[PDB]
Nucleic acid binder design. Sequence first.
RNA 1: UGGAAGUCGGAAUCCGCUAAGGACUGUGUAACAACUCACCUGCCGAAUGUACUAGCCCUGAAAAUGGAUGGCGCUCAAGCGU
Lengths: 79, 59, 158, 107, 51, 258, 42, 51, 245, 190
Amino acid sequence: AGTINKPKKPTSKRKTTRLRAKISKRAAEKKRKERKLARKNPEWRSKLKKDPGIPNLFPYKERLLQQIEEERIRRKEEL
Amino acid sequence: LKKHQAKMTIEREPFSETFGPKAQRKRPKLSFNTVDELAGYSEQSLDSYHARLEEKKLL
Amino acid sequence: NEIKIIHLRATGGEVGASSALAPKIGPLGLSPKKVGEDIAKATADWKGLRVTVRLTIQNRQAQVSVVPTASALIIRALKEPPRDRKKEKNIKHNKSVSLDEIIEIARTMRFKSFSKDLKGGVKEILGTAFSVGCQVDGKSPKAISDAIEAGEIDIPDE
Amino acid sequence: PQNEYIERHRKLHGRRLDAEERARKKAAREGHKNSENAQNLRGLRAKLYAKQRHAQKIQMRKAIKQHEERNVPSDPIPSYLLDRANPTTAARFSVPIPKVRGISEEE
Amino acid sequence: QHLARLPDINPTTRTLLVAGFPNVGKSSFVRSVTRADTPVEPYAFTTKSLF
Amino acid sequence: CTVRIWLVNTGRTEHVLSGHKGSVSCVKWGGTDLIYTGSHDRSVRVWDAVKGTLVHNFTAHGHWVNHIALSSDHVLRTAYHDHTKEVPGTEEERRAKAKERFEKAAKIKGKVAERLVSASDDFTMYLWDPTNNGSKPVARLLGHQNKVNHVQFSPDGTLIASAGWDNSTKLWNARDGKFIKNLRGHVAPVYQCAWSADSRLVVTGSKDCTLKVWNVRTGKLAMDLPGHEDEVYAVDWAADGELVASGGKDKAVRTWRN
Amino acid sequence: KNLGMRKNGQVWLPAKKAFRPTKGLTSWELRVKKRQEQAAMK
Amino acid sequence: SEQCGFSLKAQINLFKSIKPLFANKMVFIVLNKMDIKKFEELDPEMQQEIN
Amino acid sequence: PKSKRARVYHLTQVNKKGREAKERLFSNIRETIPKYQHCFVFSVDNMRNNYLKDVRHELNDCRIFFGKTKLMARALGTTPEEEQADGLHRLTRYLTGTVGLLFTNRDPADIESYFSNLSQVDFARAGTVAPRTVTVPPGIVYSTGGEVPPEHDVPVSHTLEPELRRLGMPVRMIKGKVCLGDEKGEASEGYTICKEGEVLDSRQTRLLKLFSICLSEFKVSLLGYWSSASGEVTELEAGKTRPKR
Amino acid sequence: MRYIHSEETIPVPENVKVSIKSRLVTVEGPRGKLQKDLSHIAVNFSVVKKGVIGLEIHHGSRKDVAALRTVRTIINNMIIGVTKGFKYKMRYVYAHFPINVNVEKNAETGCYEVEIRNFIGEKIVRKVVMAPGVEVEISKAQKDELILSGNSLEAVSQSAADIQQICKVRNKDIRKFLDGIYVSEKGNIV
RNA sequence: UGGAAGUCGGAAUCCGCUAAGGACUGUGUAACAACUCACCUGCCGAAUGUACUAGCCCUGAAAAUGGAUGGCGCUCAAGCGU
Ligand SMILES: [Mg+2]
């Protein structure tokens, strides 16, 4: 496009009070409506979220897995 | 039968199989079966063509 | 005194094979109706079947021979009822051929086979029978080939 | 000229001497060109371009998944109804729409 | 596209119609008496449309 | 696109009849050992059953062949079984009675000539006499406004009944193919028709979930048979005429009596 | 001299090496040992 | 000379088959390829048939 | 890196082999070891090697492996601890470059005589020294490029003309024919593909193959063989001079 | 990520002299002198070894590290230019109207000039001025071939591209009208 | 199929030799031929590939007097996060 030699009308970044107030009101109404839809949400949700686990690049992940084994064995022995 | 003849012909032979880069049509559809019938058909067709030309010229 | 070898596809018991031949064998000095004649004479055993024909040309007369192919041998072994090819089109080779006939075809095609042994040649013939679409011993040639590879069916050596 | 005259001209005289090279270089520049279109097109033309690129990406993904899975009617009907276009076919006496927006007399 | 490339044949003028079996020299004769670029080859059905 | 001939005792294929380019939707086996096939490649073929070779190829239809009927179907289905209900003692006598019934049902001008009618998706029907006419049809039966699903000769050989997708069953003369009368009571496509043994009545089973019994001599609706919850697919009239069986999408067999 | 053909015809272009700015940070043997340990952990 | 791939009998039969199309038209049978075979080199039966 | 070459997913039937092919090669070699008296190592350096199919057909009682060099070396065993048979690791010193294994029950002199008498003319690969000057004459380009006389030759196909120009021949299309200069052999000197003594590059070898001119040969050099009865490795003449690892 | 150190190397042949001062590179060979200002790229030059130039970037991003490859190939091309030279062969073809190409050397400017006439029968005379240092000759071995040679690869290839672009067919089907002047071979003089 | 040889179509899509090579990915021929891709081997030499996630950046629609992060202007900020 010939933007550099013949630029068009600039798009103003100066807001108006009317548009600022209207955007704030719409954002508040959207928050209320989203809260209402979340309260009436019929989609199934898990009781416990899925844990990501331990990252593979953590250098002592195998040692942490060993500690988990030792802890569960000690818990089973105590119980 | 006339109201369904067109859709019947398209269902029997689709457009892409008739003419085009993937067309498979080899045998044409003819109004005649013998060479003698073809000669008579060409004579009658020329007569009808000249009659329609004369009618258009008169009109 | 040079020898020229020309390969072509012909239908058995037909003189129309020389129709496409006559453009080139004409300048070579051959009579196209004569060439069609000995082609039909040599392919009279393979009536109604596409076969490969070799023409050996020396001193302006040609010797005509039939080179065996697996597909022609299988279709001949199927023993189909005779048909006229102009009226009976879109046919299928859905009959059955015995495994002994398959092995006999493999022995016939051994001169072309690069397989080390007759079991490998038989498996090649069974793959060709699979492509033709026939049956072997009433079952699928793929099933017979799998059984041969599993060792349930024993192929004679040579 | 008559019949397939440009094909015959190609057979007799070939093409321009740089034709294959220019075609190969343009096909090689297509990646930069498509990225430049994605970042520099504007307005409705940009929207239609992005939607159509979305359709290409979905079709390409479907083709790749089918090629991965290369190595792997519903209701009983009689034989005379086989191979035809048949419909899929998927107290409280309440209607499917029990309530709608009310229309005032002014509207 | 095919209609755009069809030859213009006047059906009421002086015309010589060359017919016969394939490979008998029809296109050779037409090339020898006219300026039309109808190909000549030794195989059957070299000519697949009217020229 | 094939028809296989099986030997029942061994279960082995004797002949494979191939040549059709589409699905073979209907097959009949006539009393002169000829096999008749109709196909979705728009053709009707006659094959020699002993040799497994093509005899006739009729390519008159402009769409799918849905059904074919033979003039001798009623006697060829029942063989030596008849009204008398005493069977002959010996196999030679049983075969002789079956052949006699077939020849009586197939005699035209003192000669055995099976007639074949074919019903198609091109809204039409064709009547063939391959013995006397060869490839030329006897007549083209015209008048249905939609696809013809099913067709049947009457047992006495005088009438042809056909069921259409235009909610109508039509009657035709079985000798020259001339239209006679329209049976108009169904509101959905009619899938099947079946003749009574005395050729007075035809029962039609339709998609509108009903059977209708028609008197063909008065051209009127003799009886209406409701009760099927869903579409009717299969209808048969028993050879002794006592019962009519209907079956369809509601999964339960229904038998109907006088 | 060069025995092979370059596709774009710029036959003076040198035999380039792969652009690997993190080349030389870890040795091959250490990476073999890390492959074994990572496989056992997984 | 029959180097076209079709017999002279076949060419004659094609001519007789399409002859009813030749009403009210002038017909010229052109024996081509005279440098290969002449009309005199033909058998007298074939010369007679062409006559 | 957002800027990257887009990888082409191939919609073709054949997939990459992987480690399954390596294990199958290992098992095939280790299963063929106990069935044969001798294992030869042969080399075919800078050759087309499509004649190994005919060699395999002729030696139908023998077993030829032509795989990855390091994989065949590991299949045999390169140390006495890992060797599959006694003394077999001494054979693996020949396994460098483009080599193959030949398991046979024949007498070794028969194998040596067979591969001394095996002679086949072949298309040169890049790096070979040209034995003779090859020059296409001016005028109509023929299929053999002037090796056979043009009276017995046929014109080169018009579909090869862009490929000849891409390989550097200044040919042109005149009336459906490929010509070098004019149709009458004027205004151009002949095109020299290669000079005698010059090392061929791949452009020159591709031109020679297109004109069906063979400037090399197919030759199998036996380096040495291991015997199962003695457990020892006999060195041959080619293996005396070939580098070892 | 910022890489601490990245380095490229350029080998220099025995008959070549390279002088670099404030990223202005001068390359001396049997065939003459080439110069190139590389002060738009951040790079440190050094003599790592006898006959080897070292190029290095310190604390650079991936883009700055990648730019050294361009610098390496540019200097290698100047070295190849002063040693072996660069040669572009062009072929002009036509259907009916023979293209007439005449080559002169302007004594005032020192540049070569190419005049092209009768391009598809046009009456205008197309004139292309070669870059300084590019020599144009009409070939004697082959028909309708020009040879552009020089030390600077950029100058030679741009001169060839100017000749290619001056003879452009406009408003005609280019499947049919095949006339033009095209680059047919690229290589070295030596 | 007039012709149709992996490559105008319909349907099948197996075996051998294998290091590997589809009853074929494209160019090509009237049909062949020839070329090419998949796949394999030699050379080379140390890290890569793919799909997602999070940042910041570009696009994700605009009319009509000349104008607006308030203005200048600002680019390892005079922008953004802590
Ligand atoms: Mg011809």
